[PDB]
Amino acid sequence: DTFTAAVYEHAAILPNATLTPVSREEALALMNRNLDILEGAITSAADQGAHIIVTPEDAIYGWNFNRDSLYPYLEDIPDPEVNWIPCNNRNRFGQTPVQERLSCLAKNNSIYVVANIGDKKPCDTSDPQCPPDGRYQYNTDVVFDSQGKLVARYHKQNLFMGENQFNVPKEPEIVTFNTTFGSFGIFTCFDILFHDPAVTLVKDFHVDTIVFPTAWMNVLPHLSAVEFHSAWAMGMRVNFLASNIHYPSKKMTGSGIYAPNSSRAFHYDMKTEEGKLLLSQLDSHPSHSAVVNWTSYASSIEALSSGNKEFKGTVFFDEFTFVKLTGVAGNYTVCQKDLCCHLSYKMSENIPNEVYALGAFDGLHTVEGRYYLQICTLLKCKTTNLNTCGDSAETASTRFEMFSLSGTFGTQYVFPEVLLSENQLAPGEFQVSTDGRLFSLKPTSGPVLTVTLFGRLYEKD
Ligand SMILES: *[C@@H]1O[C@H](CO)[C@@H](O[C@@H]2O[C@H](CO)[C@@H](O[C@@H]3O[C@H](CO[C@@H]4O[C@H](CO)[C@@H](O)[C@H](O[C@@H]5O[C@H](CO)[C@@H](O)[C@H](O)[C@@H]5O)[C@@H]4O)[C@@H](O)[C@H](O[C@@H]4O[C@H](CO)[C@@H](O)[C@H](O)[C@@H]4O)[C@@H]3O)[C@H](O)[C@H]2NC(C)=O)[C@H](O)[C@H]1NC(C)=O
Ligand SMILES: *[C@@H]1O[C@H](CO)[C@@H](O[C@@H]2O[C@H](CO)[C@@H](O[C@@H]3O[C@H](CO)[C@@H](O)[C@H](O)[C@@H]3O)[C@H](O)[C@H]2NC(C)=O)[C@H](O)[C@H]1NC(C)=O
Ligand SMILES: N#C[C@@H]1CCCN(C(=O)c2cnc(NC3(c4cncnc4)CC3)nc2)C1
Ligand SMILES: *[C@@H]1O[C@H](CO)[C@@H](O)[C@H](O)[C@H]1NC(C)=O
Ligand SMILES: *[C@@H]1O[C@H](CO)[C@@H](O)[C@H](O)[C@H]1NC(C)=O
Ligand code: NA
C-alpha cells in the first residue's frame, strides 16, 4: 500500500502591520488573499493524484503579532469529536469562514488538507489559568479529510521566543488521525526539537507519518530545515511531510517529503520569491522496526587519534571541541565531556583552501531556547581560519569517497544529517548501522557541507 503525498512551500502575503488591531473584515480579506494561493496548490496536488496536502505554519496571516493585533484573525475551532463538515453545515458554530473554506477545499478536491490557523477559546475569570484578556489564543493546525470533515485540531505546545500572541495548552495535545493510507501524527515547527508531543506520537502512538506545518528560520550547519527535518524522520523511522514558509529574507526555505530510509523530494530556494508544490509517493505502513543503539560501536572502540591539536569552535552559540582534518584520509577521535566522537574518512581529492574539522558537543543550548544537546559533527569550516569552524558555510568543493561517524551518545534520540553544497540532501547515499554509525554507501554526489549525528537529551532540558 502506497499513497501520493504533497507539500507546498508558500510565499505568504503578510499583513501591512500594525499599531492598531485590524477589523475582522480587514483580517479576513488578507486571509482570503493567502487562501486563494493555497487553493491553487490544493487543486494541482489533487489534479496530480495526491491523497494529502500540507500547507505551512502562519501561511494565512504571518508571524508578526501581539495578542490584540492577532485577535481579529482567530476562529473558535470546535473539538474534532463534534463530527463536523463545515462545508455542509456552514453556521453550526457561528462565524467560521476560514474553516468553511478549508473544508470546501478538502471536499471539492477530494483531498486531505493540513493547514495552520488561529484558535480562540473564551474563558472565565473563574478558571485560574484564564488570561486577563478573557480568552486563550492558540497557534493551531487543522486537518480536513477528503469529505471535508474536521478530523484533527492541534494547539502548538512549544512556543518560540516572541510568540507572545499565543498560549501554551495545559497538557500536551497528542493528536492523530487515521486514514486508508496509514496512521498520522501532527506537530508544528519548534515542536520537532522537544519530546512532547513529537516523540510520544512516534514511540507510544506508533504513527506511520507526521504532517509538519512549519515557518522555519534556517541555521547552518545543523539546523537547516530540509537537513534536520529529514534527519528527524530517519532517526524516528517515520514518513514526514514538511511544508514551509517561503521568505528568503528571514532564511525561510526548505520543504520536502521524507521516508524512514531517505528523503523522497525536497525544495530549497534562496533566490526567487516564488512558492513550490512538491509531490511524491510513500509507503502507507513503512517498517519502523530498524532499531539503532547510538553508543554501541563508539563505546566499544579505543581513541582513533592520539595527542591532537584541539581547539574550541562556536556552532550556533555552542562551544564545540574540534580537531582539524589533516590529510586526504584519516581516523580521528575528539571528546567533549561525556561525549566521544569517532570519524574515519577518505576525500575524493585534497582541495586547496578548504578546511574540515571533527567536532564534539555535550551541553545545554540556551540562546533563543533551552534544550540539551550531544552532537558529533564532520563540518566544512567557512574559511581556512580554524576560528570559522561551526560558522554557517553554504558551499563546498570536497566530495568524500567514504565516511563513518559515531559517538558515545547518552541518548536514544539521535538524528543523522548529511548535507551537501548548497543545502542539497544526499538520498540514499548514506545509511545508519544497528551499531550507531552514520556511513557512506557510495562516494558523495556533490561536495560535503556536513555529516552530523544530532543527539537530544530530553531529561536534561
Ligand atoms: C487505524 O486504521 C488501520 C487501518 O484500518 C487499523 O488497522 C487495521 O486493524 C484491523 C483490526 O485489528 C486489522 O484487521 C485484522 O487483519 C488480520 C489480517 O492481517 C492483516 O492482513 C491484511 C491484508 O493482507 C494486512 O493489511 C494487515 O496489515 C499489515 O500487518 C503487517 C503485520 O502483520 C504489517 O507488516 C503491515 O505493515 C500491515 O500493518 C495484516 O497483515 C485479520 O486476521 C484480522 O482478523 C479478523 O478480525 C476481524 C475483527 O476485527 C474479523 O472481522 C475477521 O473475521 C477476522 O477474525 C483482522 O481483520 C488490519 O490488519 C489493520 N490494518 C492495517 C493496515 O494495519 C488500525 O487499527 C487503526 N488504528 C486506530 C488507532 O484506530
Ligand atoms: C547500547 O549498548 C551499550 C553498550 O553495550 C549499552 O550500555 C551498557 O549497558 C550495560 C548493561 O547491560 C552496562 O553494564 C553494566 O556495567 C556496570 C559497570 O560499568 C556493571 O556494574 C553492571 O553489572 C553492568 O555490567 C554498561 O556499562 C553500559 N555501557 C555504557 C557505555 O553505557 C546500552 O544500554 C545499550 N542499549 C540498548 C537498549 O541496547
Ligand atoms: N520568524 C519566525 C518563526 C515564526 C514561527 C515561530 N518560530 C519558530 O518556532 C521557529 C523556531 N526555530 C526556528 N529555527 C531554528 C532557530 C533559529 N534561531 C533561533 N533558535 C532556533 C533552527 C531551529 N525557526 C522557527 C519562529
Ligand atoms: C465547493 O463546492 C461547493 C459546491 O459544489 C461550493 O458551494 C463551494 O463554494 C466550493 N468551495 C470551494 C472553496 O471550492
Ligand atoms: C583508518 O582506519 C581504517 C580502519 O581501521 C584503516 O583501514 C585505514 O587505513 C585508516 N586510515 C588512516 C589514514 O589512518
Ligand atoms: Na509576537
XYZ file of C-alpha atoms and ligand atoms in Angstrom:
627
model
C 0.000 0.000 0.000
C 1.323 3.417 -1.176
C -0.136 6.963 -1.388
C 0.849 10.245 -3.057
C 1.894 12.939 -0.577
C 2.002 16.708 -1.272
C 3.680 19.687 0.424
C 3.501 23.339 -0.507
C 6.196 25.931 0.226
C 4.251 29.239 0.453
C 5.408 32.808 -0.365
C 2.931 34.374 2.056
C 1.136 37.740 1.844
C 1.860 39.328 5.236
C -0.419 41.951 6.952
C 0.637 45.634 6.415
C 1.320 45.924 10.227
C 0.491 47.266 12.823
C -0.167 49.978 15.543
C -3.984 49.452 15.897
C -5.588 45.916 15.591
C -7.433 45.478 12.220
C -11.161 44.761 11.827
C -12.470 41.201 11.175
C -13.313 42.285 7.583
C -9.701 43.507 7.064
C -8.215 40.358 8.766
C -10.465 38.049 6.642
C -9.666 39.909 3.366
C -5.917 39.195 3.915
C -6.577 35.543 4.971
C -8.559 35.085 1.728
C -5.687 36.548 -0.363
C -3.421 33.745 1.053
C -6.229 31.098 0.870
C -6.635 31.787 -2.959
C -2.889 30.955 -3.361
C -3.274 27.740 -1.255
C -6.458 26.898 -3.262
C -4.211 26.971 -6.354
C -1.822 24.394 -4.752
C -4.561 22.122 -3.246
C -6.298 21.862 -6.737
C -2.990 20.944 -8.590
C -1.960 18.452 -5.851
C -5.433 16.779 -6.100
C -5.324 17.001 -10.009
C -1.929 15.170 -9.768
C -3.353 12.310 -7.665
C -2.271 13.392 -4.098
C -4.136 11.876 -1.105
C -2.954 14.644 1.330
C -1.513 18.191 1.186
C 0.334 20.072 3.981
C 0.375 23.918 3.920
C 2.827 25.893 6.222
C 2.532 27.340 9.726
C 1.324 31.024 9.683
C 0.682 30.696 5.881
C -2.662 32.568 6.211
C -1.717 35.535 8.473
C 2.077 35.630 9.174
C 4.147 35.688 12.362
C 4.084 39.450 13.307
C 1.503 39.963 16.096
C 0.711 40.780 19.739
C -2.373 39.264 21.481
C -4.657 42.151 20.342
C -3.430 42.504 16.702
C -3.916 38.676 16.297
C -7.487 38.536 17.788
C -9.390 39.623 14.568
C -7.839 36.667 12.626
C -8.956 33.991 15.141
C -11.891 31.495 14.884
C -13.494 29.225 17.524
C -12.272 25.798 16.312
C -14.525 23.125 17.802
C -13.325 19.868 19.304
C -12.984 17.451 16.276
C -15.189 14.797 18.084
C -18.124 17.225 17.403
C -18.260 15.441 13.963
C -18.493 18.389 11.530
C -18.203 19.080 7.816
C -18.023 22.957 7.825
C -18.685 22.951 4.015
C -22.114 21.215 4.536
C -23.251 22.896 7.797
C -21.678 26.373 7.434
C -23.221 28.014 10.553
C -23.090 25.228 13.200
C -20.559 27.177 15.363
C -21.246 30.806 14.388
C -18.904 32.813 12.139
C -16.215 30.393 10.831
C -15.301 31.411 7.187
C -11.683 30.042 7.227
C -12.805 26.575 8.493
C -15.645 26.566 5.885
C -13.176 27.485 3.072
C -10.637 24.846 4.182
C -13.447 22.268 4.466
C -14.754 23.085 0.937
C -11.153 22.981 -0.379
C -10.740 19.416 1.041
C -14.275 18.285 -0.023
C -14.294 19.775 -3.607
C -10.812 18.459 -4.388
C -11.356 15.087 -2.546
C -8.031 15.502 -0.685
C -6.892 15.753 2.967
C -5.885 19.330 3.761
C -3.462 20.196 6.566
C -3.331 23.898 7.375
C -2.235 26.187 10.208
C -4.663 28.857 11.508
C -5.548 30.524 14.847
C -7.899 29.311 17.582
C -9.879 31.420 20.070
C -11.204 29.916 23.370
C -13.163 32.466 25.517
C -12.670 31.727 29.224
C -13.935 32.991 32.557
C -12.256 34.969 35.379
C -13.397 31.834 37.362
C -10.712 29.439 35.971
C -7.238 30.340 37.344
C -5.220 29.878 34.108
C -7.504 32.218 32.042
C -5.641 35.245 30.573
C -6.692 38.820 31.740
C -7.841 39.160 28.076
C -10.762 36.784 28.750
C -9.649 34.279 26.052
C -6.971 31.646 25.165
C -5.305 32.074 21.741
C -3.597 29.123 20.058
C -1.390 28.532 17.015
C -3.491 25.680 15.586
C -3.164 23.045 12.927
C -6.389 21.788 11.383
C -6.884 18.631 9.300
C -9.851 18.214 6.965
C -10.392 14.837 5.361
C -11.302 14.104 1.681
C -15.032 14.595 2.542
C -14.435 17.972 4.209
C -14.665 16.822 7.840
C -12.525 18.352 10.671
C -10.575 15.232 11.836
C -7.789 16.975 13.863
C -7.152 20.137 15.817
C -3.649 20.647 17.295
C -2.539 23.599 19.516
C 1.256 24.232 19.432
C 2.956 23.143 22.658
C 6.445 24.543 22.166
C 6.157 28.251 21.531
C 9.272 30.030 20.284
C 10.651 33.366 21.606
C 8.303 36.236 20.757
C 5.205 34.082 20.125
C 3.563 36.273 22.838
C 0.291 36.408 20.788
C -0.246 32.684 21.683
C -0.915 30.477 24.713
C 0.563 27.058 25.631
C -2.080 24.299 26.341
C -2.387 22.928 29.933
C -1.358 19.385 28.889
C 0.451 18.450 25.622
C -2.016 17.547 22.872
C -1.155 14.148 21.282
C -3.160 14.486 18.082
C -3.518 11.650 15.493
C -5.964 10.921 12.621
C -6.410 7.555 10.948
C -6.850 7.118 7.170
C -6.905 4.317 4.497
C -3.198 5.351 3.827
C -1.819 4.948 7.408
C -1.966 6.448 10.930
C -0.943 10.163 11.008
C 0.573 12.295 13.780
C 0.856 16.070 13.803
C 3.027 18.773 15.380
C 4.326 22.267 14.347
C 7.738 23.864 13.785
C 9.726 24.183 17.103
C 7.863 21.055 18.391
C 10.404 18.905 16.426
C 13.111 19.949 18.990
C 11.157 18.616 22.006
C 9.772 15.278 23.347
C 6.083 16.308 23.637
C 4.068 15.583 21.552
C 6.728 14.769 18.849
C 8.451 11.633 20.385
C 5.241 10.375 22.093
C 3.411 10.255 18.689
C 6.147 8.048 17.276
C 7.129 5.772 20.225
C 3.802 5.489 22.074
C 1.093 6.183 19.474
C 3.022 4.273 16.733
C 2.092 6.748 13.906
C 3.206 5.935 10.332
C 3.552 9.581 9.135
C 3.948 13.050 10.634
C 2.328 16.074 8.951
C 4.513 19.122 9.750
C 3.377 22.757 9.099
C 6.499 24.932 9.629
C 7.792 28.605 9.386
C 11.480 27.657 9.981
C 14.468 30.031 10.125
C 17.447 28.168 8.704
C 20.537 27.862 10.934
C 23.557 26.128 9.305
C 25.445 23.807 9.852
C 22.882 21.594 11.678
C 19.548 23.332 11.685
C 18.688 23.915 8.052
C 15.020 22.851 7.514
C 15.500 20.122 4.795
C 18.576 18.849 6.670
C 17.148 18.478 10.208
C 13.552 17.504 9.196
C 14.797 14.561 7.074
C 17.292 13.669 9.845
C 14.426 13.575 12.434
C 12.301 11.438 10.052
C 15.237 8.971 9.605
C 16.116 8.876 13.354
C 12.415 8.310 14.321
C 11.777 5.802 11.415
C 8.666 7.577 10.162
C 7.266 9.321 6.986
C 7.472 13.123 7.287
C 5.609 15.839 5.328
C 7.374 19.202 5.824
C 5.535 22.306 4.477
C 7.489 25.536 4.957
C 7.051 29.293 4.552
C 8.995 30.801 1.615
C 10.716 34.008 2.877
C 14.471 34.005 1.895
C 14.893 37.410 3.636
C 14.367 35.593 7.056
C 16.163 32.471 5.791
C 12.828 30.672 5.454
C 13.010 27.902 2.776
C 13.087 24.113 2.840
C 10.087 21.805 2.248
C 10.085 18.084 1.465
C 8.603 14.589 1.690
C 10.742 12.235 3.739
C 10.730 8.468 4.295
C 12.473 6.476 7.076
C 15.240 5.331 4.584
C 15.904 8.722 2.882
C 14.423 11.956 1.519
C 11.876 11.441 -1.351
C 11.532 15.028 -2.667
C 12.939 18.280 -1.234
C 12.975 22.036 -2.190
C 15.469 24.718 -1.170
C 15.491 28.124 -2.872
C 17.080 31.313 -1.587
C 16.896 33.156 -4.980
C 13.220 33.542 -6.145
C 10.185 34.925 -4.225
C 8.005 32.020 -5.555
C 6.319 29.096 -3.803
C 6.705 25.424 -4.737
C 4.346 22.446 -4.802
C 6.072 19.072 -4.250
C 4.616 15.564 -4.765
C 5.995 12.092 -4.015
C 4.811 8.585 -3.239
C 5.269 6.946 0.189
C 4.552 3.580 1.840
C 1.369 3.771 3.894
C 2.809 1.424 6.531
C 6.605 1.844 6.441
C 8.724 -0.505 8.525
C 9.531 1.151 11.917
C 11.440 -1.996 13.201
C 15.045 -0.843 12.273
C 16.423 -0.285 15.843
C 19.795 1.580 16.361
C 21.899 1.666 19.579
C 23.746 5.011 19.179
C 26.634 4.325 21.698
C 27.426 0.657 20.799
C 30.342 0.896 18.281
C 31.770 4.102 19.822
C 31.817 2.818 23.452
C 33.492 -0.466 22.303
C 36.478 1.009 20.309
C 39.600 2.913 21.643
C 40.547 6.566 20.587
C 41.415 6.601 16.803
C 43.819 9.601 17.139
C 46.236 10.425 19.997
C 47.805 13.718 21.227
C 45.947 16.107 18.922
C 45.831 19.836 18.177
C 42.374 20.598 19.629
C 40.513 23.948 19.728
C 37.187 25.484 20.879
C 34.855 26.477 17.994
C 31.383 28.118 18.119
C 28.398 26.357 16.432
C 25.035 28.228 16.801
C 26.307 29.842 20.086
C 27.560 26.437 21.382
C 31.282 25.772 22.123
C 32.376 22.560 20.392
C 35.771 20.809 20.812
C 37.299 20.445 17.334
C 40.181 18.592 15.695
C 41.354 19.693 12.199
C 41.358 17.050 9.483
C 44.975 16.858 8.337
C 45.333 14.506 5.361
C 43.028 13.443 2.477
C 42.321 10.287 4.614
C 42.279 9.787 8.383
C 40.959 8.476 11.693
C 40.069 10.969 14.406
C 38.518 10.829 17.875
C 37.568 14.002 19.736
C 35.819 14.187 23.106
C 33.866 16.846 24.908
C 32.854 15.837 28.475
C 30.577 12.697 28.392
C 30.708 12.514 24.548
C 33.412 10.942 22.386
C 33.200 11.251 18.550
C 34.928 8.927 16.063
C 35.429 9.628 12.367
C 37.018 7.602 9.609
C 37.130 9.391 6.182
C 38.694 9.459 2.704
C 38.154 12.526 0.441
C 37.834 12.371 -3.371
C 40.836 14.879 -3.506
C 42.780 17.374 -1.252
C 41.111 20.654 -2.471
C 43.198 23.784 -1.621
C 41.926 26.390 0.916
C 39.146 24.079 2.196
C 39.409 23.010 5.873
C 37.298 20.288 7.603
C 37.061 19.556 11.317
C 35.542 16.857 13.570
C 33.572 18.418 16.434
C 32.081 17.224 19.742
C 29.458 18.916 21.933
C 27.956 17.828 25.276
C 25.847 20.528 26.839
C 22.775 22.741 27.051
C 21.734 25.239 24.351
C 20.301 28.432 25.872
C 20.251 31.053 23.036
C 16.587 31.623 21.981
C 15.516 28.301 23.597
C 16.706 25.667 26.069
C 17.468 22.119 25.091
C 20.255 19.647 25.982
C 22.436 18.520 23.088
C 25.075 15.875 22.361
C 26.477 16.429 18.853
C 29.220 14.716 16.756
C 29.990 16.675 13.577
C 32.115 16.459 10.388
C 31.840 20.047 9.147
C 33.386 22.143 6.372
C 34.885 25.268 8.120
C 33.591 28.531 6.454
C 37.218 29.680 5.639
C 40.853 28.323 6.213
C 40.924 30.201 9.542
C 40.154 27.479 12.177
C 38.162 30.035 14.271
C 35.471 29.918 11.452
C 34.667 26.171 12.074
C 30.993 25.922 13.038
C 30.033 29.194 11.367
C 27.419 28.698 8.558
C 29.106 27.592 5.318
C 26.806 27.307 2.253
C 29.253 25.924 -0.391
C 31.986 23.314 -0.617
C 34.192 21.608 -3.245
C 35.371 18.446 -1.318
C 33.481 15.293 -2.285
C 34.089 12.363 0.064
C 34.810 8.807 -1.160
C 33.987 7.380 2.289
C 32.899 8.435 5.834
C 31.875 6.697 9.090
C 30.721 8.833 12.025
C 29.769 7.714 15.655
C 29.635 8.805 19.268
C 29.186 7.754 22.878
C 25.653 9.187 22.913
C 23.924 9.169 26.287
C 20.571 9.182 24.411
C 18.471 7.023 22.049
C 17.253 10.098 20.128
C 19.970 10.832 17.574
C 19.173 12.369 14.168
C 21.536 11.560 11.226
C 22.226 14.567 8.993
C 24.023 14.563 5.623
C 24.095 17.938 3.822
C 25.761 18.745 0.527
C 26.697 22.066 -1.139
C 24.344 24.196 -1.451
C 21.762 22.789 1.017
C 21.232 19.618 -1.098
C 20.226 16.333 0.556
C 22.036 13.069 -0.274
C 19.390 10.284 -0.961
C 20.219 7.290 -0.499
C 23.978 7.847 -0.252
C 24.362 7.050 3.454
C 22.833 4.566 5.919
C 22.861 4.117 9.720
C 24.069 0.848 11.276
C 22.498 -1.052 14.260
C 25.878 -0.085 15.973
C 25.066 3.673 15.718
C 27.322 4.542 12.750
C 26.433 7.125 10.045
C 28.293 5.879 6.956
C 28.500 6.450 3.174
C 27.301 3.729 0.703
C 28.867 5.346 -2.430
C 31.132 8.437 -2.905
C 29.002 11.578 -2.279
C 27.296 13.012 -5.469
C 28.369 16.528 -4.512
C 30.672 18.303 -2.071
C 30.028 17.782 1.666
C 28.861 20.701 3.916
C 28.339 18.373 6.952
C 27.827 14.817 8.226
C 26.336 15.144 11.759
C 24.816 12.848 14.391
C 22.415 15.287 16.124
C 21.664 13.987 19.644
C 18.929 15.079 22.017
C 18.729 14.545 25.888
C 15.186 15.483 26.730
C 15.603 14.859 30.562
C 18.488 17.358 30.870
C 16.418 20.309 29.453
C -6.135 2.715 12.013
O -6.619 2.149 10.798
C -5.917 0.939 10.482
C -6.329 0.551 9.082
O -7.711 0.246 9.015
C -6.227 -0.103 11.558
O -5.519 -1.312 11.317
C -6.267 -2.430 10.954
O -6.807 -3.072 12.098
C -7.593 -4.233 11.789
C -8.205 -4.674 13.096
O -7.199 -5.011 14.039
C -6.706 -5.297 11.141
O -7.522 -6.385 10.738
C -7.099 -7.689 11.033
O -6.274 -8.222 9.977
C -5.895 -9.610 10.102
C -5.089 -9.980 8.882
O -3.766 -9.479 8.908
C -3.670 -8.421 8.046
O -3.759 -8.746 6.668
C -4.049 -7.548 5.928
C -4.350 -7.944 4.499
O -3.365 -8.801 3.948
C -2.938 -6.507 6.117
O -3.445 -5.279 5.606
C -2.644 -6.302 7.607
O -1.720 -5.264 7.959
C -0.332 -5.423 7.955
O 0.156 -6.062 9.124
C 1.537 -6.439 8.979
C 1.900 -7.229 10.213
O 1.040 -8.352 10.322
C 2.417 -5.212 8.736
O 3.713 -5.669 8.353
C 1.837 -4.320 7.631
O 2.537 -3.086 7.533
C 0.350 -4.067 7.842
O 0.162 -3.342 9.056
C -2.397 -7.646 8.301
O -1.277 -8.362 7.775
C -7.132 -10.489 10.242
O -6.695 -11.810 10.522
C -7.925 -9.992 11.429
O -8.932 -10.923 11.827
C -10.229 -10.613 11.723
O -10.769 -9.919 12.821
C -11.962 -9.258 12.366
C -12.483 -8.410 13.504
O -11.731 -7.208 13.625
C -12.984 -10.259 11.822
O -13.873 -9.495 11.020
C -12.362 -11.354 10.947
O -13.241 -12.455 10.763
C -11.037 -11.852 11.500
O -11.204 -12.580 12.723
C -8.358 -8.540 11.201
O -9.166 -8.368 10.043
C -5.964 -4.735 9.927
O -4.902 -5.604 9.544
C -5.316 -3.392 10.256
N -4.829 -2.753 9.047
C -3.572 -2.323 8.918
C -3.177 -1.844 7.553
O -2.784 -2.335 9.856
C -5.838 0.412 12.944
O -6.345 -0.499 13.909
C -6.425 1.802 13.207
N -5.824 2.387 14.398
C -6.514 3.056 15.337
C -5.699 3.624 16.463
O -7.732 3.213 15.269
C 23.545 0.056 23.910
O 24.856 -0.505 24.011
C 25.564 -0.168 25.221
C 26.843 -0.974 25.213
O 26.602 -2.361 25.452
C 24.679 -0.431 26.441
O 25.265 0.113 27.616
C 25.807 -0.771 28.571
O 24.782 -1.396 29.341
C 25.291 -2.386 30.249
C 24.098 -3.061 30.885
O 23.553 -4.050 30.023
C 26.254 -1.744 31.249
O 26.870 -2.774 32.017
C 26.991 -2.581 33.400
O 28.286 -2.079 33.711
C 28.464 -1.763 35.102
C 29.850 -1.169 35.230
O 30.036 -0.052 34.366
C 28.258 -3.011 35.964
O 28.202 -2.621 37.333
C 26.962 -3.749 35.615
O 26.935 -5.018 36.262
C 26.778 -3.918 34.107
O 27.675 -4.899 33.593
C 27.325 -0.939 30.513
O 28.113 -0.214 31.449
C 26.678 0.037 29.532
N 27.689 0.820 28.840
C 27.534 2.119 28.529
C 28.664 2.749 27.772
O 26.525 2.750 28.838
C 23.289 0.159 26.217
O 22.478 0.042 27.380
C 22.638 -0.499 25.005
N 21.229 -0.151 24.910
C 20.307 -0.946 24.318
C 18.874 -0.609 24.603
O 20.621 -1.897 23.596
N 10.439 34.056 12.495
C 9.896 33.091 12.825
C 9.218 31.874 13.236
C 7.711 32.128 13.334
C 7.019 30.884 13.876
C 7.608 30.508 15.245
N 9.054 30.274 15.098
C 9.641 29.055 15.442
O 9.020 28.236 16.115
C 10.997 28.764 14.956
C 11.941 28.173 15.808
N 13.186 27.836 15.416
C 13.469 28.093 14.080
N 14.733 27.840 13.603
C 15.810 27.437 14.477
C 16.244 28.525 15.372
C 16.623 29.770 14.851
N 17.001 30.804 15.639
C 16.993 30.556 16.980
N 16.632 29.391 17.589
C 16.251 28.387 16.766
C 16.835 26.477 13.882
C 15.877 25.989 14.942
N 12.568 28.592 13.135
C 11.356 28.911 13.612
C 9.790 31.435 14.604
C -17.082 23.804 -3.047
O -18.196 23.341 -3.814
C -19.478 23.857 -3.417
C -20.489 23.258 -4.371
O -20.004 22.083 -5.023
C -19.454 25.385 -3.458
O -20.656 25.915 -2.903
C -18.262 25.936 -2.678
O -18.217 27.352 -2.813
C -16.947 25.322 -3.165
N -15.835 25.829 -2.372
C -14.554 25.881 -2.776
C -13.634 26.679 -1.903
O -14.157 25.307 -3.787
C 41.696 4.494 9.176
O 41.139 3.339 9.825
C 40.822 2.238 8.956
C 40.187 1.166 9.815
O 40.952 0.881 10.983
C 42.083 1.782 8.224
O 41.769 0.728 7.318
C 42.696 2.955 7.463
O 43.910 2.556 6.834
C 42.967 4.132 8.402
N 43.500 5.263 7.656
C 44.392 6.142 8.147
C 44.986 7.089 7.149
O 44.699 6.175 9.337
Na 4.525 38.321 18.770
